Design a protein around this ligand. Structure first.
Ligand SMILES: Nc1ncnc2c1ncn2[C@@H]1O[C@H](COP(=O)(O)OP(=O)(O)O)[C@@H](O)[C@H]1O
Ligand SMILES: Nc1ncnc2c1ncn2[C@@H]1O[C@H](COP(=O)(O)OP(=O)(O)O)[C@@H](O)[C@H]1O
Ligand SMILES: Cc1cn([C@H]2C[C@H](O)[C@@H](COP(=O)(O)O)O2)c(=O)[nH]c1=O
Ligand SMILES: Cc1cn([C@H]2C[C@H](O)[C@@H](COP(=O)(O)O)O2)c(=O)[nH]c1=O
Ligand SMILES: [F-]
Ligand SMILES: [F-]
Ligand SMILES: [F-]
Ligand SMILES: [Mg+2]
Lengths: 194, 194
């Protein structure tokens, strides 16, 4: 089965995704953890380009999808055939919220591309780690990570609208402490996974 | 002004596009010559991936389009704004013929990606260097290069259908000799540039 972590930078997705991965493996599930973009050899190359080069937003959209395509074909689709629990650090909702809201690209066009790159694979549940931008920015500032407050505020809202509109999204209060946020994720998952 | 060479591998695109580059430059035009994929730094990185790594067809489609977004916004749109003659070695018809007619992906979906990546920029004329696969393959083997007969036959017919179904496309008989082929190209150009 498939579990997506979503939300803005600094909401704790890397942290919780890895905590869920270890937790679920200890309980006997065969589990996978992938990040987006990245997660394959080609995908990580694309990731380094996305994070390093100066790119217009259209080329950006195409490479995020190129990473996703390779991840879906090479690892996700097989993993799910073997009944692995696949954990994603970001998925299709990140693209809509960042490139749609955020960058201003057409939401329906982004969706068509998501569907193309995913072959229509969708999560059993998406965990939206929602957090106020000013709090996420303080968290990132401690590791010397700077992100754009005006940009991330639009993006937070997009995630919230998507959580109302798309299926199987649970809003998590990510401003809590690491153990409380993880307990709230466990309750959210209790609906679909033992 | 925008001039695009299209056609199967080994049809003389590289050769004639450079012939035309030197020709127009001697006659006083400011000219650019770009290849697809490639033509920019990021575009050349993706070209080396597309050529050397084992990719599924969907990831391929997205990378070909990503290289094209980069070339359009970084170079072609500025070039055209300065009234440069831009000569492309492969453009949007190559994606339709290879990824659509060749590998079976949806041509309307491809044409939507084309439009998104080009921002609606279309050539003034496209030169299809039509040639029988057998000849092309022979020329290619002489330079120690081998391509897939069964695949190119589909791609050639795709190019010919687009020459009818698309706009501003002239079919060049590229089986002739180099000066013979360039002579039909100049003829085709004279209804566009002088
Ligand atoms: N619940 C939490 N409370 C406070 N800080 C946290 C919490 N979870 C993670 N962090 C810290 O916040 C920073 C960003 O978290 P990370 O998991 O990398 O977020 P994301 O992957 O969503 O950007 C890291 O330095 C991390 O140690
Ligand atoms: N008119 C021609 N007749 C015979 N051989 C040619 C002709 N034009 C080019 N060639 C040779 O065929 C090979 C492929 O040409 P090239 O322009 O690289 O084709 P493409 O770019 O379409 O792959 C090159 O080695 C070139 O020297
Ligand atoms: C997967 C994805 C990530 N991103 C952003 C999110 C991050 O700011 C950045 C790198 O992601 P990360 O910090 O979570 O690893 O790429 C998008 O804008 N669109 C997308 O589709
Ligand atoms: C521009 C483009 C090229 N190709 C193929 C054509 C070539 O076989 C291959 C390398 O290009 P080249 O031989 O013309 O240099 O990339 C596609 O499949 N789709 C595309 O959109
Ligand atoms: F993340
Ligand atoms: F990450
Ligand atoms: F991160
Ligand atoms: Mg991360």
């Amino acid at each position: 089965m498939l579990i997506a972590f979503e939300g803005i930078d600094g909401s704790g997705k890397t942290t919780q995704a890895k905590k869920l991965y270890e937790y679920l493996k200890q309980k006997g599930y065969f589990v996978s953890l992938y990040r987006e973009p990245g997660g394959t050899k080609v995908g990580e190359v694309l990731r380094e380009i996305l994070l390093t080069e100066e790119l217009d937003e259209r080329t950006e959209l195409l490479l995020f999808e190129a990473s996703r395509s390779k991840l879906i074909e090479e690892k996700i689709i097989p993993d799910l055939k073997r009944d692995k629990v696949v954990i994603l650090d970001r998925f299709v909702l990140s693209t809509i919220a960042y490139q749609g809201y955020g960058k201003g690209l057409d939401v329906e066009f982004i969706k068509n591309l998501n569907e193309f790159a995913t072959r229509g694979v969708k999560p059993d549940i998406t965990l939206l780690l929602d957090i106020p931008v000013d709090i996420a920015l303080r968290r990132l500032k401690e590791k010397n990570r700077f992100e754009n407050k005006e940009f991330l505020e639009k993006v937070r809202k997009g995630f919230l609208e998507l959580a109302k509109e798309e299926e199987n999204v649970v809003v998590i209060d990510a401003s809590g402490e690491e153990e409380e946020v993880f307990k709230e994720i466990l309750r959210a998952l209790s609906g679909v996974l033992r």
